[PDB]
């Protein structure tokens, strides 16, 4: 009741920023995360330095995203939980359907500002074999 931001608007703004950056500069992706952030792209790694390395090892080249649906809701302690349903094509390999789960927590200081506390990615084709 403090005029909490709209979770959907917070959701859609983060999602454009993330996939924009994943495309334009995947080097810079680590700037979304904090010391206690968990990251999975298919064992979890924690914190900016380890997340950055995980990013690099997956060679993100001319990386093209197609988002089909986005759900964002308010969660514990002023968070937003986001499920993304899209397609990803890495170096013009065939577009592959993915699910991604994000948790966005407030920085606590700055206004309207968030970091990524959780990032879970999974291709659906690896799971329904």
């Amino acid at each position: 009741v403090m005029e909490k931001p709209s979770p959907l608007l917070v959701g859609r703004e983060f999602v454009r920023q993330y996939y924009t950056l994943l495309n334009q500069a995947p080097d810079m992706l680590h700037r979304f995360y904090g010391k206690n952030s968990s990251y999975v792209h298919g064992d979890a790694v924690y914190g900016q330095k380890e997340i950055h390395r995980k990013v690099m090892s997956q060679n993100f080249t001319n990386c093209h995203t197609k988002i089909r649906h986005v759900d964002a809701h308010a969660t514990l302690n002023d968070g937003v939980v986001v499920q993304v349903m899209g397609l990803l094509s890495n170096n013009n390999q065939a577009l592959r359907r993915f699910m991604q789960t994000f948790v966005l927590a407030p920085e606590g200081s700055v206004a309207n500002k968030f970091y990524v506390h959780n990032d879970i990615f999974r291709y659906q084709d690896e799971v329904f074999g």
């Binding site: 920023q17 309207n112 500002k113």
Partner: peptide, 18 residues
């Protein structure tokens, strides 16, 4: 972006987000 995400300067912001 009325909403900030992660750790970027206003200069980086312009290059990527607008």
């Amino acid at each position: 972006p009325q909403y900030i995400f992660g750790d970027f300067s206003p200069d980086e912001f312009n290059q990527f987000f607008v």
